[PDB]
């Protein structure tokens, strides 16, 4: 009985790293990685750090293996301040919360997402957060958070609104 993915990310000078959390799954991570690391984009070295409570399966572990230098994974819960300190939210360039687009109750998923963003804001208010919202009113709920300020960069992507 052991935690194989327990560890602390190490900040690298001159290299921006972003943290990805929320709904982490083989398909979602594959789509995010093929969009983020596309050749047509300008050459910028950004280190992706995935934070998720459920340990990855063999397919997801292999997918992380192909992106050996590009990405990193750390098993933890977004709620814990210690886990957030492990992935270096303080030095992170951005934090991205993915969402389960296909869920039994969209309000419950929005509640989990507002949970996660409130946790990140509580640990570190300055950090910029890009999230996905299934319902439009919950975006207005997001605006109620004190540190949710758009000027420095803070984005809520409402899927219903944009669709």
């Amino acid at each position: 009985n052991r935690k194989k993915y327990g560890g602390s990310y190490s900040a690298v000078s001159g290299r921006k790293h972003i943290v990805v959390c929320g709904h982490i799954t083989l398909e979602s991570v594959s789509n995010f990685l093929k969009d983020f690391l596309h050749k047509d984009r300008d050459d910028v070295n950004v280190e992706i750090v995935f934070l998720h409570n459920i340990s990855p399966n063999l397919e997801l572990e292999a997918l992380f293996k192909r992106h050996f230098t590009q990405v990193e994974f750390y098993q933890g819960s977004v709620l814990n301040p210690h886990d957030l300190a492990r992935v270096k939210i303080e030095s992170a360039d951005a934090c991205l919360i993915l969402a389960n687009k296909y869920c039994a109750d969209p309000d419950a998923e929005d509640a989990s997402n507002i949970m996660r963003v409130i946790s990140i804001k509580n640990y570190h208010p300055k950090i910029r957060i890009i999230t996905q919202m299934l319902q439009y009113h919950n975006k207005a709920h997001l605006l109620n958070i004190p540190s949710w300020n758009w000027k420095e960069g803070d984005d809520a992507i409402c899927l219903a609104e944009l669709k």
């Binding site: 190490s10 000078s13 397919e59 293996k65 192909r66 050996f68 230098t69």
Partner: protein, 276 residues
């Protein structure tokens, strides 16, 4: 001439490997304690380059990975061939063809170890990996062997533990993707590596009797007989036609039953089910 051995000097190779491993540990821990008590980075640049090399992210990386696969198989075959020779012998480097191939293999493995060390994030936990350990106890003995013109078949069976890092190799090359196939290759690699490594250790301890008896407990077991003995043992069959007679062989059997019978009983049915 012939009959080149009358005494034993295994401690040379053993101490060379041991001092390499333990000096690495001491230097790393001393650096840690000394630090505790006090552009974009060229160290970071070389670390990233080595990380790209270790993976099959480039054509040269794929070539390196395929070469690692092939030369691990080749070094295992070399150990198999050399298993028939006596435990200690004297041979000439520039007149024998197997030592030159083994030297080339070990030079490649040393350079690959250097690349892996450069690419590693945590140096301490990299020093304690199984691949690093089998690199510590396999290459320095071969260098000592070529220097002294004297070959001792010692921890060469540890080369079989290089067979474990094969599922990761196939995952780097994008060949191995689905979870079932990854699980199959993992189980097969672990099972066969453990089987062959335990068989090699039994072969070494039986052919070289326990030291406190002045090496008078030789059983003269060929490697295939030791493989068959391990199969019969961890399969729980236990014929009794072949068994370990030395104290060290019996000790390893006692401590290997606990971890090997469970491994067999949990791996073989799962492998059969997955192939089915």
């Amino acid at each position: 001439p012939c009959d080149s051995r009358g005494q034993r000097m295994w401690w040379a190779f053993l101490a060379s490997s041991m001092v390499t491993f333990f000096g690495g540990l001491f230097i790393i821990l001393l650096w840690r304690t000394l630090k505790y008590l006090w552009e974009v980075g060229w160290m970071t640049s070389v670390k990233d380059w080595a990380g790209v090399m270790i993976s099959a992210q480039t054509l040269t990386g794929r070539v390196l990975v395929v070469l690692v696969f092939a030369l691990s198989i080749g070094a295992l075959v070399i150990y198999f061939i050399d298993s028939s020779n006596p435990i200690e012998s004297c041979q000439n480097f520039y007149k024998d063809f197997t030592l030159q191939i083994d030297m080339a293999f070990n030079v490649f493995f040393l350079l690959y170890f250097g690349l892996r060390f450069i690419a590693a994030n945590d140096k301490l936990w990299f020093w304690l990996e199984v691949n690093s350990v089998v690199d510590f106890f396999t290459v320095p003995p071969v260098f000592v062997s070529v220097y002294l013109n004297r070959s001792w078949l010692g921890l060469r069976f540890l080369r079989a533990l290089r067979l474990i890092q094969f599922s990761e190799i196939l995952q780097f090359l994008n060949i191995l993707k689905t979870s079932n196939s990854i699980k199959l290759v993992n189980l097969l690699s672990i099972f066969i590596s453990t089987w062959l490594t335990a068989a090699g250790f039994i072969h070494l301890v039986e052919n070289s009797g326990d030291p406190w008896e002045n090496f008078q407990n030789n059983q003269a077991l060929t490697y295939w007989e030791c493989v068959y003995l391990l199969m019969v043992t961890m399969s729980t069959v236990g014929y009794g036609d072949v068994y370990a007679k030395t104290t060290l062989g019996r000790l390893f059997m006692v401590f290997f039953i606990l971890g090997g019978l469970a491994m067999f009983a949990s791996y073989v049915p799962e492998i059969i089910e997955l192939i089915g």
